[PDB]
Amino acid sequence: KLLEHKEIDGRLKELREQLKELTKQYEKSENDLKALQSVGQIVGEVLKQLTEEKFIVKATNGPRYVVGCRRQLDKSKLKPGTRVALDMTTLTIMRYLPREVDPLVYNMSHEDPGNVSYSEIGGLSEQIRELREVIELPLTNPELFQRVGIIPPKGCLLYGPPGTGKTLLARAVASQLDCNFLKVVSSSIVDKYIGESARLIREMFNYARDHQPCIIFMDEIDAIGGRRDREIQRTLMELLNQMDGFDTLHRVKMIMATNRPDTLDPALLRPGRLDRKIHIDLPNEQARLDILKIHAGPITKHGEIDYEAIVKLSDGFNGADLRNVCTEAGMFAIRADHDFVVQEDFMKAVRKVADSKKLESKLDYKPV
Template identity: 25%
Template sequence: MTNFGAPRFSRANRGNCVIFSASLRAATRSTASSASRTAASSNGAFSSSPISIPINGKHHPQPKKKRPMPKPKKPGIIESVLANPALPIERRLELLATLAANPGQENKAILAAILELLTASQGPELYAQKLAELNELIKQLQDGPLRNALFIQICQIPGSSVRQAHVVLDDGTGAYTAVPDAKLADSLRPGDCVILDGKGRALLARAGDSRKVGDVAQLERWVNEAHIEITGRTQERCVVVAGQALRDKFQAGQAPPGSNVLVSPRQSVALDLMPSQDGLAHYRYLEKKPVPEVSVEEDIGAPPKCIEELSEMIRLELTNPELRRRYRLPRCATRLLAGVSGSGKTLAVHAIWRRMYETMSEVTGTPLDKLPPRVFSLRMSQVLVMWLGESDRNLDRYFSEVEQLADEPFVAPDGKSYKLPCLAILEEVDGLAAARGREPIYDRILTTALQRLDPARQELRDRFIIYIATTNKPDVVDPAFARRIGSSVEFFSRLNRKQAFVAVLQKQLRGLPLASQNGYAQPELLRKLSADLAAWLFSPNGTDKGLVELTYAGSTTPQVRYRRDFLTGALVNRAVQQAAEKASRAEDGAVGPPGLSFELLVRSFDDQLRGIVEQLNEQNAREYTDVPDGVRVATLRRIAQPTHLAVEFQRT
């Protein structure tokens, strides 16, 4: 039968096959005779019986010796043939192919034995490799951890053939260590992070360029090609070594004085030049929140004139700047919004913010949400820090960021470039710019603000910036600061005029559900509700007998303050919100007619006013109601109020 698994030989190779077969038989006979001799000697070694040794006339058998460890299994006949170097490699490959082509149990055992022999032959080499690795690990553990340092320069010590490296350790200690590798010594550059042995006696390798951490300092000047003078965090000047990366950038003209550099302060080495800041991430005071949803026509009852004035100024600067230059008008504008708390200053600022973006969107043809952030906001909590000199530097950075962004052009979708305005908001400026003489730290901050807001500065006049400051206490603001920030001052007063109150109230009630009455439509209900509430607050013949009596120092005649004397835009907003909350709960419980009613609004206003009266005293009366300038409140008496309002007794 034909064996399809066996390899087939051509006629030309039959002579070689005869030689191969003869060699195989000779190797088989040699291997068999060797195996028989080994077996005979082995049987003779272990067939002898134990020897009995006489002790005191008695024979005691000698203990059996422990058998030696079994020797590795010797290769069989086929394995020996395959491993015989006297046979040509082609013959051995043909025999191995024959074994692999016939997957019988015997052939599989032979192949497994071959693989075991290959593994055993690599055992000593693998053992030697693992032993060397273990010895290296033990040596490193004994030597201790490697040390980190910054390379400065290569030095040649007289009388020594080994080159030494001047390095600075992490604690700032300098050292001279040997560099055994000449190629490594030639490749080192100043400022490289290198690895020393545990005792710092030899420089082993370069650690790479991953170590780029430290302090940021300002480059003042190059002392020479290897040293620079910097100003650090403490505003003190010092000279440090310049790393090779910084030297290369200086040679390329990329590291002029005034640049920011990365410095390792303990090692006194300037590592590299700080990369330029991209985008808007480095602006600390830039507002990145959405544009406020404030409409002058719908949300502000009595809009201050500064909103329209600034809106028109922005439009002219974007569309016809030459007209303003003809009249020598500066591009920068400043406003001071002063008034009592809750009088609408913040709402006016948000309205200016919205108008500015609407104008920019109209002129540039860019959607409102696609315009870049252009508003900066400053609060005292962002300026004051405990370190001397840091507070005024924070304020100086605020003004620098505003001027920097004002210089950045904006490219519209049509490809046209614009210099868009920047809105800089300084909230509660009375804490920032109080009259000088209070504390030295505040005087330094005020001095910085006065210098940056000087209208004679050409850098300020030529930039499209709008500064708006707000304050509740204009009398405590430093006069020099008030003149510079308040080229125009907008005063916000209480709603003690009936027309202003009605305008604000209607803006607050617009769009809210009103309780139906005698078939009136919603617009008619709004007008009637506003008129009734204004009559309840402002009518001289109404039920208002006054809330408090104020007696000024040096006078015996008390001054009565009525409900209308405490009205502000914030109070109207709180009262409307309270009434809306009650109306929503009543509608949910099906209690009474749905919508806001006159009775609900009266109760809400009365609750808000009573809450203010409970907080009044002689010292804070000026914060909640108008008091003449230069007058001190000597006594304050609360007027008793009825338990129930008159409106509660009316039939619904």
Template identity: 70%
Template structure:
């Protein structure tokens, strides 16, 4: 009986020791994590910043001409870990402070307004939620959805897919709701643009925003751009006007240029909406830019 008591005592003591060992192992693991975090913070404090530059051209397999953000140009090498297929003329890169070696490739610079356009949530809208517009939904899906989902169909038939569609009709007939339904039902990036927000008081800023918007769309294909209230920048041009009118005309010309710059089978589609189609510029409405005009009339039965 004494031996049994000693055994139980030793067993309890062993279990206590095991619990202490587990506790110590947990503390060691936490201390190691804290040590690694402290080491990373220390490296961040000791690390030197890098210069942002632009790649101009490639001389050979190892040497490149880059332009630093401060202005001068350099012939530099490249870090081994950088993927060579990303080093194309116009790419943004970071350069080491001392050797000016290319350290990494950066994504293109995009205006924060464009990111806000892409981040807007269209909500959950299905085509069945839109009543009385069955024929219009079919036309829009043929123009926007079909070329993105099945582009080979257009190649086999020999038809150029439409670049964009104009939705016009009285206020409150569901033009914006249709665009939201398209954004929810296709697997593509979606940019919602309020045309009046593009206009800037500084000369050239509105045109630059249009360029960055289409550049972002081409990098994130397939992509659908929805421009609401397009009559804010797409009005008919005239010779006389104030400086603000001329800035809006410059914005329209940049938009026309970007629409013409699309590739034939590019996976970037544009939807424009307005309730004043009579004031739009004829150059915007011609075939090749906005190939389809869909009237969103009052709902049928």
């Protein structure tokens, strides 16, 4: 006799779920419709005040006007140059805005490094720790700098041989700090129209200034950082004087990477900026073992694998190479249909990485 107890009960449950989805339809079709009765406010930038109710605004590439406060805008929160939005009809300032713009700087601030940790670094110890001395302590604990009586350092340069986790240490630092981050490709900085490189760096550094605490990181700074076509040099100047000269208060630190520290313009290498230079050497045999074990856990490694043979065969390998080894080992595994990897697969991978290394032979690299 459950038919009458359950049929209309399920009917009401289903109809209430349908009502809940149709309420979402109603709220969306009403909310966007009452959003339809709106007009885009003009975007522009203010100049000197004249009175408490008279302000000059440049309306972007259009003309410039004088206008007044709507009712609810703090006059003191307006400064010459602050970004504002105005009524289309009367041009009176509808709202102030967070200063400055640019999708490119967003793209420089919204790329994720992935999940990394300092333990997931190949035992660069000192190096890593030094980079924490120059960044972690200044941001989290400036009180110790104040008590000692020293100014926190601004920046560090990663250098040394390639493939030594050049980006990896920065990825770790970014993933282990809750602060605004700006990765930029140095070559991606420069653009043709003359002065867009300088203005783009300007906007980037204003972004960092207005989003403290921030970490700006340039990879491959030698793209434009070399000693002094000439537009590259002027871009270097823009960096070179933005990087100190107007003030120093910043809760903002710059990390730089280079595959050629020697060619870097001496002006950059100046101790006041570039506060430290961290050499990330070719990984040692013990360091190579450390890296191996760091890239070993997640593998479906099987039986027992004697890493020291890999180490003493992988002498002179860049840390990165080690990753290859592991991947190639799985290749042998997929060529053996194993759900596992054995010691001799690692031996084969090491010997093939050695085979590749001769083509990959080391550059004509000169460190400082």
